[PDB]
UniProtKB/TrEMBL annotation, chain B:
Keywords: Ribonucleoprotein, Ribosomal protein. It comes from Callithrix jacchus (White-tufted-ear marmoset). It is found in: Rough endoplasmic reticulum. One of its GO terms (cellular component) is rough endoplasmic reticulum. Residues 150-187 are annotated as: Disordered. Belongs to the eukaryotic ribosomal protein eL18 family. The keyword Ribosomal protein applies. It comes from the Eukaryota. GO terms for molecular function: RNA binding; structural constituent of ribosome. Residues 1-187 form the Large ribosomal subunit protein uL15/eL18 domain. This is Ribosomal protein L18.
Amino acid sequence: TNTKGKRRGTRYMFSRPFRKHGVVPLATYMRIYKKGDIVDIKGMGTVQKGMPHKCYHGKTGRVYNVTQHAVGIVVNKQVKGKILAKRINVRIEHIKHSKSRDSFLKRVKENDQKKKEAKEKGTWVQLKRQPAPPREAHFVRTNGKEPELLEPIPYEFMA
Amino acid sequence: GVDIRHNKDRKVRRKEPKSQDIYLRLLVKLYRFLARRTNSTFNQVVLKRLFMSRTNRPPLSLSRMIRKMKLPGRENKTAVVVGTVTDDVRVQEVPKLKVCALRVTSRARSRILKAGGKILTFDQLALDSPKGRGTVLLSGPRKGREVYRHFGKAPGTPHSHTKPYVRSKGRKFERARGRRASRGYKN
Amino acid sequence: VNVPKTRRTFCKKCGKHQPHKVTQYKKGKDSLYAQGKRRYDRKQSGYGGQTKPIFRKKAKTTKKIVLRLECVEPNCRSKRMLAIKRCKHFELGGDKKRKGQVI
Amino acid sequence: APSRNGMILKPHFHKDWQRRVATWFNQPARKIRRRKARQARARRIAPRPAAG
RNA sequence: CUAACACGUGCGCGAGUCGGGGGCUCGCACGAAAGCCGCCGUGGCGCAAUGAAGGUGAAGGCCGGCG
RNA sequence: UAGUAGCUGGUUCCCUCCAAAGUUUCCCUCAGGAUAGCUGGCGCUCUCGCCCGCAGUUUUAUCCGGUAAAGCGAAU
RNA sequence: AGCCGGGCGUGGAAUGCGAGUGCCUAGUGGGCCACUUUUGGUAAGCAGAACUGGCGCUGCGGGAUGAACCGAACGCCGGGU
RNA sequence: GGGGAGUUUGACUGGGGCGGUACACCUGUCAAACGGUAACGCAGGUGUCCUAAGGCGAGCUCAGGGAGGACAGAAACCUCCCGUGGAGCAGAAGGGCAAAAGCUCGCUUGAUCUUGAUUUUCAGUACGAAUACAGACCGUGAAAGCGGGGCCUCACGAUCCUUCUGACCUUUUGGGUUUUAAGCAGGAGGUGUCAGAAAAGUUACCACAGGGAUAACUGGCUUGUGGCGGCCAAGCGUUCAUAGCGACGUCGCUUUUUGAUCCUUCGAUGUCGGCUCUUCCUAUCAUUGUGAAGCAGAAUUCACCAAGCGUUGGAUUGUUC
RNA sequence: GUCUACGGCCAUACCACCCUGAACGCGCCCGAUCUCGUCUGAUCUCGGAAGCUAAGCAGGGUCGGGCCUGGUUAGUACUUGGAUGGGAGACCGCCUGGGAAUACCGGGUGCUGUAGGCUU
Ligand SMILES: [Mg+2]
Ligand SMILES: [Mg+2]
Ligand SMILES: [Mg+2]
Ligand SMILES: [Mg+2]
Ligand SMILES: [Mg+2]
Ligand SMILES: [Mg+2]
Ligand SMILES: [Mg+2]
Ligand SMILES: [Mg+2]
Ligand SMILES: [Mg+2]
Ligand SMILES: [Mg+2]
Ligand SMILES: [Mg+2]
Ligand SMILES: [Mg+2]
Ligand SMILES: [Mg+2]
Ligand SMILES: [Mg+2]
Ligand SMILES: [Mg+2]
Ligand SMILES: [Mg+2]
Ligand SMILES: [Mg+2]
Ligand SMILES: [Mg+2]
Ligand SMILES: [Mg+2]
Ligand SMILES: [Mg+2]
Ligand SMILES: [Mg+2]
Ligand SMILES: [Mg+2]
Ligand SMILES: [Mg+2]
Ligand SMILES: [Mg+2]
Ligand SMILES: [Mg+2]
Ligand SMILES: [Mg+2]
Ligand SMILES: [Mg+2]
Ligand SMILES: [Mg+2]
Ligand SMILES: [Mg+2]
Ligand SMILES: [Mg+2]
Ligand SMILES: [Mg+2]
Ligand SMILES: [Mg+2]
Ligand SMILES: [Zn+2]
């Protein structure tokens, strides 16, 4: 059977990208994580302290505790037929703010603003994101040039 | 052929009391009629609770009843409980209450009558208030039974304050291996 | 491994870091009147032969050796047990090694 | 074998308990006999206290 | 089938509950039943837990009197 | 002494409803058990005749990867 | 960071559907087959895995025959397709 | 003190046994781009080592190469230049690392005391290992800081018993003092079959409950091996590739050899040969009819239709051969 | 236009050679009493201001290497789902969707934050 080591099969997952080894850029250290941010997990092999287990690599969780160097986050893990929301502590290098939430936040601010506006105007405005509707009817103008014929080319071997 | 599942097709709720006595069944007849020919849902709740079993109709204590009726806004309303009103001895001052219950302890009934309240039974309650206006529907603590201390997450498992099943309490009964860091492990 | 004979470390009684004299802990002589021993001879006496098991399948060639620490402060002189990882050869404060010499 | 959850029990029926069983089917007859003896002694000691 | 335990259900009473052992009932067809005891509740279970043990043992919140 | 048997054989009426597993971990464990998983029964708390949630699905965003392919005039 | 008090309902993608929760619990813990992926093997109706569906637990029309293939899953009947 | 008694004599497992450990662990792959994922699959490693190879701080830069300098050279030491790591970091492998995680010095013992939480296998239980904290005592540095072992992934052990350490600790039972003993908490002494019995064989004198979950026949699938047959045409055949052969290749057929497997049979299908007797196949030895020869005749080759009819008597061996 | 101090993103910023640098600045540079450290004031530390853009540094150049970004390769390779499709097989075609990577050919060669200067 296999081995139950903590880092089995991570030679590519925890490795560094090509031509990106060396000193960790300081912007990663200079970011602020508060209680309740949605955050992504991406193990970085450069630092070995507080490295998350390989099964949380690429997972997104919620911050619930902030500490000197690390952050505690609640993340869902599918174990057999059930999902457990378990909390793990990850050092700040292996973490990154999720941009999936800021889009929704900006949308909230923007449609709240356009709801506050036009409230006095009384006009109607659409807020829900409708799915891509079918294309409407239109005209395709030929400019006096007729469409050119397309025919299959004859078979002839290359190799 | 239809792509459906029949596991949860049949609902398990009670249609009628499992009991066989005749007085409760007469009450059930009356409240069945009331529930189906009145739009008030108090009758529906009362009939449903009449259907229930003994362990689902826990007794309500006098202290609980006075505590829940002393709350603001609910003065001079009738306290309705489908269970048994038992006396509480650790309460001296008892006000006058208008109680309705299936059965009341003798000492509790004496206490209420001495205090000046009146005891009602669900029949006379129907006559007084068919739709049940001015009623405070109470119930005893359902989780009061001691069997619930044995339920839930199993003992000998981290962060589980569940009572084990032990034939006798003492220092020689389930205290050594799973309960101490000194002997094996501590959960 | 090599361990020095003196170590400045925490002392429980003093509640502060103090110098400690360290030695190697060796098992004491088994008292004949321990409860377990007394029960053992009471059970073994008579007929029926051997009762408790005798271990034979030895497997480990080493053992964790324990350092006995003693606070050098004459008033305190408290003692504590400290153990570290297994080792085949072990010595106390011998031939402090130096680098870059003739092999 | 243990089931899911329950109490560990130590029934003391590992001997030949079925040979030494004390049924109490003579309890009413014993009570009747003790009574009869009681009244017989009470009659025997004519004016003396029955209790003793 | 007996005993033990767990849980679910039905009934009585309910911070209590239970005579199973004994006794009183002119012993005796049924009746070896049934009724009663209450200063026969000894006692069991419950009402308090925790600690190895010595042991300890289950709210407090506002104003006037020397922020 | 009706000795024990994780092993063979047998295990008695009808209809109705629901309906599996041969997988995880531990065991002198491998023809067996315990434990999760899968099943049934008993319920209970609410709900509609504005709104709550949920989904073996899609959409819109946003991250995660080193297989198929490809490369050796790029590292090994 | 926690507290209070106050104001905002166009319920902020599509589709579908009542949901949550608690006890007690039997049987099972020999599996097999197929498209695709795949390891050992010259290979096998061989041995070993992943996903899904089946057989086992399942009858029916077709493949003459048939545990698994194709269609389709079942109360007792009449008509139609 | 096998005269006699009681008992034991692991598991896995292409039958069992011998072999091996796939039995507790770790790296890469298998593994199908989350995770997980099998086989006695593949390549390997572990039961240690370290007073520093732990912890800080400072200063330097490695492997290799080129050009120079008395002995001196291919290689001894010095200097300059190039040098993205091609070196080193204890060990297997993988990841990671350049004013460092490497090399050299300075000072030290965070490898110390203590309560909780979390991750890894997972049942989401332990052990082991690890991660963030928090509370004291410290080390180092000017300091920010860093450090409660080794850059990360592995290097280890329940109950019962014994032993040591701790408190002006509790009990030692009618009261008191002192020895003793028992407790409470933390380490150590094991169980490598590594969630942990105290354990040698033989039976052809054997027994029981079972098993076609499993071997020894046949029969099935397979056809490597055996047997037989093709295509190509290097060469042999004095000359001439193909009268007759045919190298180096390559495609098949058969189940009269052996393997491989374990589907049927273990509440039994009588398990080698020979004797006797019948029938069938053709991949034809002879005979009938043919065609080709390196066929003058004779003899003998190769091929075709073809199984109608024949295919013996003996020595040796249980033999089949 | 540009520099210095501290930086962010870390080659569009690197590497090789060549040309030009007004002012400030950054440097090279001059010495070792003190602070400090070496075999050596070479480095480090300290005290200065005779000279110089020679070098570093900045800007620019190269049908430059590299790097970054496009086209081609290419709807090719591969691939989700489907068929009582083909083929003895090996494999291949089609339907429904997604869709690469070399060679080869183009373009570009650091943006920018805070504070403080020079261009009087
Ligand atoms: Mg139907
Ligand atoms: Mg059901
Ligand atoms: Mg003796
Ligand atoms: Mg069972
Ligand atoms: Mg049970
Ligand atoms: Mg029997
Ligand atoms: Mg068995
Ligand atoms: Mg069987
Ligand atoms: Mg891979
Ligand atoms: Mg490939
Ligand atoms: Mg198979
Ligand atoms: Mg089914
Ligand atoms: Mg079917
Ligand atoms: Mg057919
Ligand atoms: Mg029809
Ligand atoms: Mg013997
Ligand atoms: Mg995958
Ligand atoms: Mg350094
Ligand atoms: Mg600390
Ligand atoms: Mg180190
Ligand atoms: Mg013999
Ligand atoms: Mg078989
Ligand atoms: Mg020739
Ligand atoms: Mg026969
Ligand atoms: Mg026979
Ligand atoms: Mg022929
Ligand atoms: Mg100088
Ligand atoms: Mg210059
Ligand atoms: Mg110049
Ligand atoms: Mg170029
Ligand atoms: Mg700037
Ligand atoms: Mg001017
Ligand atoms: Zn001390």
